[PDB]
Amino acid sequence: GQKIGILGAMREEITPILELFGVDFEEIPLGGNVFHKGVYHNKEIIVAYSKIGKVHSTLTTTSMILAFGVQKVLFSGVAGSLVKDLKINDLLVATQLVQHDVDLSAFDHPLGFIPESAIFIETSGSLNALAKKIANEQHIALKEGVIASGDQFVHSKERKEFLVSEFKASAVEMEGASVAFVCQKFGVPCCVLRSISNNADEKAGMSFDEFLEKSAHTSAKFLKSMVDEL
Numbered sequence: 061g062q063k064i065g066i067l068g069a070m071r072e073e074i075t076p077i078l079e080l081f082g083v084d085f086e087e088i089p090l091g092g093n094v095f096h097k098g099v100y101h102n103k104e105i106i107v108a109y110s111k112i113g114k115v116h117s118t119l120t121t122t123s124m125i126l127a128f129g130v131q132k133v134l135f136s137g138v139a140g141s142l143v144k145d146l147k148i149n150d151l152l153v154a155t156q157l158v159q160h161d162v163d164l165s166a167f168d169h170p171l172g173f174i175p176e177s178a179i180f181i182e183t184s185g186s187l188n189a190l191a192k193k194i195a196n197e198q199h200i201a202l203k204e205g206v207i208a209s210g211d212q213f214v215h216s217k218e219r220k221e222f223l224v225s226e227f228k229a230s231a232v233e234m235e236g237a238s239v240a241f242v243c244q245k246f247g248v249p250c251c252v253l254r255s256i257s258n259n260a261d262e263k264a265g266m267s268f269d270e271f272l273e274k275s276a277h278t279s280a281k282f283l284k285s286m287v288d289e290l
């Protein structure tokens with residue numbers, strides 16, 4: 061009898077999800093987004109891609125909670141690896157996220173900090189546990205770690221190094237921190253999943269286009285597993 065929200069940043073990331081669920085989906089348009097509301101194993105699921113960035117992901121998450129009353133939010137998308145032990149197509153679940161492009165240093169504030177907020181945002185302990193359990197049941201090398209979210213596609217060793225030293229981030233993306241932040245403000249458990257589709261290096265743009273499809277599917281599958289266990 062639950063209500064579960066599922067989000068992707070791109071249409072490419074949620075089409076595999078709608079496929080895998082295989083149920084009739086009702087399409088409700090709202091705020092520039094199209095929500096796919098169906099039913100599945102007695103769980104009401106609302107799926108959608110937010111479009112790219114912090115503004116887009118924040119808007120959609122807030123509508124998904126205030127309009128559809130979803131009780132849990134799962135995110136599935138692709139990301140860029142910042143550390144060497146996280147490889148293309150690997151899976152990672154974010155323990156904590158940060159907004160790496162936030163800079164109020166002119167007020168002598170650490171980077172990533174905003175008054176009345178926090179540098180790190182935590183995700184659901186129960187959902188991350190569930191994710192870990194499942195990964196062992198199918199011998200999947202699921203990884204854990206901090207994820208940096210900003211409104212810039214990271215494609216430079218230089219920035220890559222800034223993110224690992226400053227926040228000790230493992231992967232970089234563009235919608236993680238937004239989604240998790242909003243869920244926290246509304247007290248909704250959030251889980252952020254990401255498949256590595258590139259290395260955030262000079263060759264990142266290229267590496268991204270090639271693995272978009274494979275990565276988006278590794279991610280969609282795992283997540284469908286979690287919705288089954290719910």
Ligand SMILES: Nc1ncnc2c1ncn2[C@@H]1O[C@H](CSCC[C@H](N)C(=O)O)[C@@H](O)[C@H]1O
Binds near residue numbers: 069070112137138215
């Ligand atoms: N290295 C990286 N730096 C920032 N975001 C990355 C990233 N690798 C993957 N991402 C993620 O996947 C998307 C990359 S932006 C996609 C651009 C697309 N080719 C176009 O031109 O329309 C974002 O949703 C972001 O969350």
